Amino acid sequence: KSCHLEEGGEVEVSFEEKEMEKQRLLYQQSRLHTRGAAEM
């Protein structure tokens, strides 16, 4: 639920939004410890 909420909840369709959102989602995924958790 946290990762889903951190998808589009925080029209224009510009590079100022299509890249900030992608970087934020990547940071959210990395903060979840992709290493270790995938094997779990």
UniProtKB/Swiss-Prot annotation:
Tissue-specific expression: Detected in skeletal muscle (at protein level). Fast- or slow-twitch skeletal muscle.
UniProt superkingdom: Eukaryota
UniProt modification remark: The N-terminus is blocked.
Subcellular locations according to the entry: Sarcoplasmic reticulum membrane
Role of this protein: Cytosolic calcium-activated calcium channel that mediates the release of Ca(2+) from the sarcoplasmic reticulum into the cytosol and thereby plays a key role in triggering muscle contraction following depolarization of T-tubules. Repeated very high-level exercise increases the open probability of the channel and leads to Ca(2+) leaking into the cytoplasm. Can also mediate the release of Ca(2+) from intracellular stores in neurons, and may thereby promote prolonged Ca(2+) signaling in the brain. Required for normal embryonic development of muscle fibers and skeletal muscle.
Summary of subunit composition and partner proteins: Homotetramer. Can also form heterotetramers with RYR2. Identified in a complex composed of RYR1, PDE4D, PKA, FKBP1A and protein phosphatase 1 (PP1). Repeated very high-level exercise decreases interaction with PDE4D and protein phosphatase 1 (PP1). Interacts with CALM; CALM with bound calcium inhibits the RYR1 channel activity. Interacts with S100A1. Interacts with FKBP1A; this stabilizes the closed conformation of the channel. Interacts with CACNA1S; interaction with CACNA1S is important for activation of the RYR1 channel. Interacts with CACNB1.
Domain notes: The calcium release channel activity resides in the C-terminal region while the remaining part of the protein constitutes the 'foot' structure spanning the junctional gap between the sarcoplasmic reticulum (SR) and the T-tubule. Pore opening is mediated via the cytoplasmic calcium-binding domains that mediate a small rotation of the channel-forming transmembrane regions that then leads to channel opening.
Additional notes on this entry: Binding of [3H]ryanodine indicates that the heterozygous channel is activated by Ca(2+) concentrations 4-fold lower than normal. Single-cell analysis of cotransfected cells shows a significantly increased resting cytoplasmic Ca(2+) level and a significantly reduced luminal Ca(2+) level.
Family the UniProt entry places it in: Belongs to the ryanodine receptor (TC 1.A.3.1) family. RYR1 subfamily.
Name the record gives this protein: Ryanodine receptor 1
Organism: Oryctolagus cuniculus
Lineage per the UniProt record: Eukaryota, Metazoa, Chordata, Craniata, Vertebrata
Residues of the full protein shown: 3731 to 3778 of 5037
